[PDB]
Enzyme design. Structure first.
Site, PDB file in Angstrom:
ATOM      1  N   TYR A  24       0.849  -1.314   0.019  1.00 15.47           N
ATOM      2  CA  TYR A  24      -0.011   0.197   0.031  1.00 15.47           C
ATOM      3  C   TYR A  24       0.929   1.136  -0.039  1.00 15.47           C
ATOM      4  O   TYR A  24       0.791   2.252  -0.604  1.00 15.47           O
ATOM      5  CB  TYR A  24      -1.058   0.087   0.990  1.00 15.47           C
ATOM      6  CG  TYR A  24      -1.474   1.236   1.229  1.00 15.47           C
ATOM      7  CD1 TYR A  24      -2.495   1.777   0.327  1.00 15.47           C
ATOM      8  CD2 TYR A  24      -1.142   2.328   2.482  1.00 15.47           C
ATOM      9  CE1 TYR A  24      -2.892   3.305   0.542  1.00 15.47           C
ATOM     10  CE2 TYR A  24      -1.571   3.344   2.663  1.00 15.47           C
ATOM     11  CZ  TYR A  24      -2.529   4.092   1.558  1.00 15.47           C
ATOM     12  OH  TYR A  24      -2.726   5.085   1.781  1.00 15.47           O
ATOM     13  N   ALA A  77       1.666  14.986   3.694  1.00 11.41           N
ATOM     14  CA  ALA A  77       0.383  14.301   4.083  1.00 11.41           C
ATOM     15  C   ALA A  77       0.440  12.764   3.566  1.00 11.41           C
ATOM     16  O   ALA A  77       0.619  12.731   2.250  1.00 11.41           O
ATOM     17  CB  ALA A  77      -0.844  15.189   3.364  1.00 11.41           C
ATOM     18  N   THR A  78       0.416  11.845   4.337  1.00  8.86           N
ATOM     19  CA  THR A  78       0.452  10.448   4.053  1.00  8.86           C
ATOM     20  C   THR A  78      -0.888  10.109   5.013  1.00  8.86           C
ATOM     21  O   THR A  78      -0.726  10.070   5.983  1.00  8.86           O
ATOM     22  CB  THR A  78       1.404   9.739   4.055  1.00  8.86           C
ATOM     23  OG1 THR A  78       2.267   9.975   5.372  1.00  8.86           O
ATOM     24  CG2 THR A  78       2.748   9.989   3.239  1.00  8.86           C
ATOM     25  N   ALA A  79      -1.808   9.466   4.445  1.00  5.85           N
ATOM     26  CA  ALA A  79      -3.139   8.912   4.989  1.00  5.85           C
ATOM     27  C   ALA A  79      -2.523   7.704   5.852  1.00  5.85           C
ATOM     28  O   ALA A  79      -1.374   6.879   5.177  1.00  5.85           O
ATOM     29  CB  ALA A  79      -4.203   8.629   4.011  1.00  5.85           C
ATOM     30  N   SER A 106      -2.648  15.101   6.761  1.00  7.82           N
ATOM     31  CA  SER A 106      -3.632  14.475   5.948  1.00  7.82           C
ATOM     32  C   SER A 106      -5.074  14.685   6.345  1.00  7.82           C
ATOM     33  O   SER A 106      -5.134  14.510   7.601  1.00  7.82           O
ATOM     34  CB  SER A 106      -3.566  13.134   5.577  1.00  7.82           C
ATOM     35  OG  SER A 106      -4.702  12.234   4.928  1.00  7.82           O
ATOM     36  N   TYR A 130      -9.062  17.659   1.041  1.00  7.82           N
ATOM     37  CA  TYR A 130      -9.872  17.507  -0.046  1.00  7.82           C
ATOM     38  C   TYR A 130     -11.471  18.191  -0.130  1.00  7.82           C
ATOM     39  O   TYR A 130     -11.578  18.496   1.107  1.00  7.82           O
ATOM     40  CB  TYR A 130     -10.330  15.856  -0.119  1.00  7.82           C
ATOM     41  CG  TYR A 130      -8.927  14.997  -0.439  1.00  7.82           C
ATOM     42  CD1 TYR A 130      -8.638  15.264  -1.602  1.00  7.82           C
ATOM     43  CD2 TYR A 130      -8.332  13.953   0.415  1.00  7.82           C
ATOM     44  CE1 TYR A 130      -7.174  14.275  -2.085  1.00  7.82           C
ATOM     45  CE2 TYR A 130      -7.200  13.280   0.135  1.00  7.82           C
ATOM     46  CZ  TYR A 130      -6.890  13.460  -1.179  1.00  7.82           C
ATOM     47  OH  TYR A 130      -5.821  12.785  -1.723  1.00  7.82           O
ATOM     48  N   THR A 156      -5.618  19.500  -2.194  1.00  6.16           N
ATOM     49  CA  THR A 156      -5.172  18.424  -3.176  1.00  6.16           C
ATOM     50  C   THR A 156      -6.275  18.421  -4.448  1.00  6.16           C
ATOM     51  O   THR A 156      -7.369  18.561  -4.314  1.00  6.16           O
ATOM     52  CB  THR A 156      -5.234  17.000  -2.729  1.00  6.16           C
ATOM     53  OG1 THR A 156      -4.240  17.062  -1.614  1.00  6.16           O
ATOM     54  CG2 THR A 156      -4.657  16.104  -3.769  1.00  6.16           C
ATOM     55  N   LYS A 204      -2.184  21.651  -4.419  1.00  9.55           N
ATOM     56  CA  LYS A 204      -1.312  20.619  -4.361  1.00  9.55           C
ATOM     57  C   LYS A 204      -1.618  19.421  -5.424  1.00  9.55           C
ATOM     58  O   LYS A 204      -2.803  19.059  -5.576  1.00  9.55           O
ATOM     59  CB  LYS A 204      -1.452  19.851  -3.217  1.00  9.55           C
ATOM     60  CG  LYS A 204      -0.689  18.666  -3.096  1.00  9.55           C
ATOM     61  CD  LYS A 204      -0.769  18.093  -1.519  1.00  9.55           C
ATOM     62  CE  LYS A 204       0.044  16.580  -1.271  1.00  9.55           C
ATOM     63  NZ  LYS A 204      -0.593  15.584  -1.863  1.00  9.55           N
ATOM     64  N   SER A 226       3.298  18.205  -7.907  1.00 12.25           N
ATOM     65  CA  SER A 226       3.168  16.874  -7.204  1.00 12.25           C
ATOM     66  C   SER A 226       2.397  15.972  -8.381  1.00 12.25           C
ATOM     67  O   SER A 226       1.461  16.435  -8.825  1.00 12.25           O
ATOM     68  CB  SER A 226       2.631  17.321  -5.972  1.00 12.25           C
ATOM     69  OG  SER A 226       2.123  15.630  -5.436  1.00 12.25           O
ATOM     70  N   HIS A 228       1.271  13.205  -6.639  1.00  9.82           N
ATOM     71  CA  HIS A 228       0.855  12.551  -5.657  1.00  9.82           C
ATOM     72  C   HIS A 228       1.709  11.056  -5.603  1.00  9.82           C
ATOM     73  O   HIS A 228       1.024  10.086  -5.402  1.00  9.82           O
ATOM     74  CB  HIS A 228      -0.703  11.933  -5.963  1.00  9.82           C
ATOM     75  CG  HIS A 228      -1.665  11.640  -5.067  1.00  9.82           C
ATOM     76  ND1 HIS A 228      -2.573  12.648  -4.515  1.00  9.82           N
ATOM     77  CD2 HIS A 228      -1.746  10.651  -4.094  1.00  9.82           C
ATOM     78  CE1 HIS A 228      -3.435  11.979  -3.429  1.00  9.82           C
ATOM     79  NE2 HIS A 228      -2.676  10.989  -3.287  1.00  9.82           N
ATOM     80  N   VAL A 262      11.956  12.624  -3.593  1.00  9.06           N
ATOM     81  CA  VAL A 262      12.898  13.016  -2.645  1.00  9.06           C
ATOM     82  C   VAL A 262      13.371  11.985  -1.668  1.00  9.06           C
ATOM     83  O   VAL A 262      12.802  11.560  -0.848  1.00  9.06           O
ATOM     84  CB  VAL A 262      12.494  14.354  -2.149  1.00  9.06           C
ATOM     85  CG1 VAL A 262      13.633  14.885  -1.271  1.00  9.06           C
ATOM     86  CG2 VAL A 262      12.114  15.587  -2.962  1.00  9.06           C
ATOM     87  N   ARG A 263      14.541  11.713  -1.806  1.00  9.17           N
ATOM     88  CA  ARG A 263      15.250  10.557  -0.892  1.00  9.17           C
ATOM     89  C   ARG A 263      16.651  10.991  -0.493  1.00  9.17           C
ATOM     90  O   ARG A 263      17.126  10.299   0.570  1.00  9.17           O
ATOM     91  CB  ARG A 263      15.300   9.285  -1.821  1.00  9.17           C
ATOM     92  CG  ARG A 263      14.173   8.641  -2.615  1.00  9.17           C
ATOM     93  CD  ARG A 263      12.852   8.329  -1.496  1.00  9.17           C
ATOM     94  NE  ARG A 263      11.837   7.717  -2.178  1.00  9.17           N
ATOM     95  CZ  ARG A 263      10.813   8.427  -2.123  1.00  9.17           C
ATOM     96  NH1 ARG A 263      10.595   9.830  -1.788  1.00  9.17           N
ATOM     97  NH2 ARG A 263       9.640   8.036  -2.973  1.00  9.17           N
TER      98      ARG A 263
END
Ligand SMILES: Cc1cc2nc3c(=O)[nH]c(=O)nc-3n(C[C@H](O)[C@H](O)[C@H](O)COP(=O)(O)O)c2cc1C
Ligand SMILES: Cc1cc2nc3c(=O)[nH]c(=O)nc-3n(C[C@H](O)[C@H](O)[C@H](O)COP(=O)(O)O)c2cc1C
Ligand SMILES: Cc1cc2nc3c(=O)[nH]c(=O)nc-3n(C[C@H](O)[C@H](O)[C@H](O)COP(=O)(O)O)c2cc1C
Ligand SMILES: Cc1cc2nc3c(=O)[nH]c(=O)nc-3n(C[C@H](O)[C@H](O)[C@H](O)COP(=O)(O)O)c2cc1C
Ligand SMILES: CCCOc1ncccc1CN(C)c1ccc2n[nH]c(C(=O)O)c2c1
Ligand SMILES: CCCOc1ncccc1CN(C)c1ccc2n[nH]c(C(=O)O)c2c1
Ligand SMILES: CCCOc1ncccc1CN(C)c1ccc2n[nH]c(C(=O)O)c2c1
Ligand SMILES: CCCOc1ncccc1CN(C)c1ccc2n[nH]c(C(=O)O)c2c1
Lengths: 330, 330, 330, 330
Positions: A24, A77-79, A106, A130, A156, A204, A226, A228, A262-263
């Site tokens: 996921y 934001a990460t759900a 999020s 949203y 978003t 976004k 973005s 997403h 981005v890492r």
């Protein structure tokens, strides 16, 4: 184990999370062409470092939408952060407070707007929004963000429907999200949201210069370039590759931000050289939570901070104001 | 075993060195994008050989900073040669004396400036210098180089801090080096060094034309186009790809040299066709030491010499003066 | 076994030849960059077929240096054919006679000039020549070719010295060849050879337009664009990629031929579309000998003939005169 | 098993079909360069989605040659459907009737023209035609198509001879097809066919703008840009890459269609953005039959329909009329 870069955090997360949860978080849309490209594109932009500039005292601080931050590296934001670690968004906001950077929460966070503000009262906090079919609950979120000291709304705009991530279909929630998010969202709804709040609003998910210009015309205060995390439409370009067109299009009227791929500290440096004010990270934060909750998020953000400091120093940049377009060429 | 090219020497070294020592020598910075590119870039430049030129008597000799050498292939500075072979830098300088080429001695060499000059009294020898926070020890090294018959100073300018090689972190010394090297080094410190010695000074680690022009303006005598063997900032271009811009920028005022990725005689030919006077090799020398000390370094340098002779002959070049830009196209 | 394309013949040869002999035939120079590129380059040129042209009666015949051939596909010089099959060059010339195409005989053939002419009295035969340090034996070969009904001299000009094939060093002959071939060969020696014989002379191994123009100025009658099957200087371009520059350079004064990487009928079609009169094959002939001597060479040449017929028909070309530059784009 | 994309259907088909039958369906010509490129080329065209357009009510309907269809995704001609499933072409036409899209029936279909019209009386049906050496049977097929309610003729023009698929040679029918198809077919035969029927005629297999212009000049009503699923001439470009030249060449005089490599909804969107009216699918239909006959074809077409709906919605397109060239860049 000894994790020294963001990829080591991902590898550790794959080793401890249930396959369905790792898949996921990791997955992109369809054949994952954009997911690969978000990373590969950064490698195509080459750095042209200046020598002998005096980088003894590197200063990573900047501002996002008028608020000071310790570094141009912020949490996106990460759900579903509570699926990585029991402390979820409260762990994340506590790490952001420690680092002096901002957290984008999020609107599908498990922790409430109030709960996150209570865990990170001194943290720079923004709300990702949203426009839900239920405009009453949309308005209530914006008012709660205002009341609880959040400093901007990230609306978003690339999710009329959720993308087709093949592993999620191979492994309920997605149906409940599809029921809630409004596919009819138009620029008229942006006019409504711009009238609803005096907070800064960032669009976004913009990938086109013409849409960026329309966001400026509607009185928005920033663009987050973005795709997403490559989870929506597959086969869009890498964010780093569309960034220059968007920076050109807005003619310095609003801040431009980037996420997607981005890492490493050199990724941050390339995005700032091409005109981004700051970058956001999604998946790296989830890998941090999976390792060790708050301390894991803090470790990921400290790795990115120190990689970025070293990249700035080796390229001859004392501070973010001297990062210029001659540092990069594709 | 039977080693017939430089890659065979690397493979042998991997088979006999402790993993931590092999990894220290092999590694590049971060994801090693530039480490791969230093080699891949040479393959993209194609050779356009002239036929029927009369190459019966090929002459590889040239000069570096006014001193005659047997071939445009010289030994670059590599710290910690005694970890590859007990004889370390004394083995290397004895091989250089045999071949008639020059040795650049690291300022972090285990063997002293005097000891190397005693082992290779008739060898062409140069000192690589870092501007240490302790300017007294910096000055003492330059004076010892002058007194012991060294013919130039190569000042390394791409190392305000050491790069992040991930295997070195996974496997003390690096902290002691960070304590010693000055991150504040500026063009003012180059003015100081240019006043300190009448020896020729080469700026080692320049990647930009504008910096090359500034080195000429400060009265330096050469540029070594170098990315430190891809060990400093990852995602800089390959040295062979920036060489033409640097040659263009200095307008023939100073000699331009190259290191980074030289493994074959055709690499040497491509660098000279693009305007380098000579090239330096780092890792190949360490692999030579690991095989058989002095005789292993001699073998590596003889392989490169003979590969270069053959590439010159097959391309129609009797001597290095007839190597021209029409031999190569990207 | 059932071999239906040229790669199947190679795979069979690898299965039956001693490793050292297969490696001698297969190998290119050094890292084999050009060996890979000779094949990959053909894949980059794309075909733009015309439909509805009437290809019921395809005619593959053409001429080479004024002599009619059945197809624009001829056998190139390959030393040491008797190591693939006991019948060596006599098997090859008998296959060429059957097919109605020409054979270029190596000057290091095991079978004599006379023996090959006796085995293939009605075959179109050419002599490949090296200018040996011994000009007496060079002259004797040319006179024997004249007397025994050979129709042209292909003078190899890219071999002042033999290339460095790494497997041959890992696995005598090469020293004996180096003793014989003259590295001093110049355009003055081409003037000598042009005075020595009235036969057509083709310069084999030209890769530059300026050298092609010099060959025309010296009264030669053709250019064979060749990198010696990628066995001489590694990192030269693919022959198909330099062909257009050479065709442009000679302004239709002499025929231009190609070898290097021809494995399929579409390779032949691309070379003719870019202006080659005919192509030569090296290694495929050796694989044919390894399978079944004369019948194996005949099978390889028949596979290439029929692949070429099909490619011509599918691209709308009834005969070689209608193959034009609009059929291909890179 | 759970099949959620077209590649899963292929994988399932490989698992249940006899190797010789799977290889017949999967294979391309010769080294399969074009087969790979038909897919890879779609990945090189990137999507530039517009946000905030209101995509609540996406309408996929369009028209093909004046006949309404439910989606711009139609079934292409594929011989030998009864080798995938006992119901063969009757299964396919029943699925097309359910979906509201059109079926192109192969002229080498096992089911007769009448039988298919009886199974799919309300389905949009077209006949693919070869001009057979026997013009009497060619005419009889056209008259039967007219009488049985077929709405267009797709004349295949890229098959004077059948291509060389290597697996079919390694694993009768091909000889019988070669006996029947006329290699002499010219534009004069197109004039004959245009006089023979008032039905719309589409030229299937055009890859060049000049041929597309000649098809318009002969009074044909459409071009299907096709390389025959990469089964004819290998090394032609991908259909998506030649589409823009063909659309430019016909100046809006006739509809332009595409096949070759369509596997995903984003492939459909890219082809329409570059000016195709609709696309056809070959192999995906065969994989559907292999899974579950009529229901498998219906499932494949529903997957493509829903992927296409999602790609349209995420790119800001309510209907096919607003799909424009600014959505894509190579
Ligand atoms: C597991 C996951 C959940 C996400 N949830 C949201 C969300 O609820 N709202 C949102 O606007 N973006 C969401 N995103 C997208 C991120 O905000 C951001 O665009 C992306 O993660 C950046 O790419 P990266 O993961 O390569 O850093 C999510 C991304 C991931 C991977
Ligand atoms: C193990 C190692 C140690 C090195 N030590 C030094 C040093 O002390 N000083 C310096 O200026 N450069 C140093 N270099 C960089 C080399 O001088 C040179 O830039 C590089 O090795 C050339 O790349 P190559 O290894 O591909 O030939 C070192 C490189 C390696 C691999
Ligand atoms: C085993 C072998 C032996 C060869 N011997 C000769 C030779 O004696 N003289 C010569 O002019 N070329 C020679 N060539 C080069 C061929 O004439 C030709 O340039 C090359 O084989 C064409 O490339 P291909 O093998 O990909 O067709 C040889 C090539 C091979 C592979
Ligand atoms: C197994 C198979 C059989 C085919 N038979 C025919 C045919 O009889 N007539 C025809 O015009 N095209 C035929 N085609 C070509 C298709 O109509 C179409 O050009 C191609 O399949 C589209 O490529 P795709 O398979 O990647 O969708 C066939 C293709 C395949 C794979
Ligand atoms: C193991 C957890 C599976 O969580 C899901 N699975 C499927 C669908 C949705 C979710 C989670 N939810 C509620 C959301 C909500 C809003 C979102 N915005 N972007 C994303 C994303 O994943 O990219 C979002 C996911
Ligand atoms: C097994 C040996 C591990 O040797 C180290 N390990 C970590 C850090 C330093 C060293 C060695 N030292 C003293 C230096 C000194 C100056 C240098 N300049 N460049 C390099 C380099 O490695 O690229 C340098 C290395
Ligand atoms: C198993 C056989 C090993 O035969 C060799 N081995 C090493 C060196 C030479 C040979 C063979 N000889 C006499 C020649 C003679 C002239 C040549 N021209 N080109 C080539 C080539 O191989 O590309 C030539 C080879
Ligand atoms: C297992 C089945 C093997 O069927 C064959 N095998 C070999 C040759 C022919 C066929 C099938 N037939 C009659 C046709 C007829 C017309 C065609 N048009 N295109 C194709 C194609 O395959 O691309 C065609 C195939």
């Amino acid at each position: 184990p000894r994790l020294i870069c963001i990829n080591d955090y991902e590898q550790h997360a794959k080793s401890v999370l249930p396959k369905s949860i790792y898949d996921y978080y990791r997955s992109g849309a369809n054949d994952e062409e954009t997911l690969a490209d978000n990373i590969a594109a950064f490698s195509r932009w080459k750095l042209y470092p200046r020598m002998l500039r005096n980088v003894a005292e590197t200063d990573l601080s900047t501002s996002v939408l008028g608020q000071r931050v310790s570094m141009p590296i912020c949490v996106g934001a990460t759900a579903m952060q509570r699926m990585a670690h029991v402390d979820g968004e409260l762990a994340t906001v506590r790490a952001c407070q420690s680092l002096g950077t901002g957290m984008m929460l999020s609107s599908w966070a498990t922790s409430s707007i109030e709960e996150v503000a209570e865990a990170g009262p001194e943290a720079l906090r923004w709300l990702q929004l949203y426009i839900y079919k239920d405009r009453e609950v949309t308005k209530k979120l914006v008012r709660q963000a205002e009341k609880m000291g959040y400093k901007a709304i990230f609306v978003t705009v690339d999710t009329p429907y959720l993308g087709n991530r093949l592993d999620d279909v191979r492994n309920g929630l997605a149906a409940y999200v599809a029921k809630a998010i409004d596919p009819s969202i138009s620029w008229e709804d942006i006019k409504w949201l711009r009238r609803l709040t005096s907070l800064p609003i960032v669009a976004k998910g913009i990938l086109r210069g013409d849409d960026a210009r329309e966001a400026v015309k509607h009185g928005l205060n920033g663009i987050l370039v973005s795709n997403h995390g490559a989870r929506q439409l597959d086969g869009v370009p890498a964010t780093i590759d569309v960034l220059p067109e968007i920076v050109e299009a807005v003619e310095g009227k609003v801040e431009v931000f980037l996420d997607g791929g981005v890492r490493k500290g050199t990724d941050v440096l390339k995005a700032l050289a091409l005109g981004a004010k700051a970058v956001f990270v999604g998946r790296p934060i989830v890998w941090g939570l999976a390792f060790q909750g708050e301390k894991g998020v803090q470790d990921v953000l400290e790795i990115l901070k120190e990689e970025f400091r070293l990249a700035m120093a080796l390229s001859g940049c004392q501070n973010v104001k001297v990062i210029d377009k001659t540092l990069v060429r594709k």
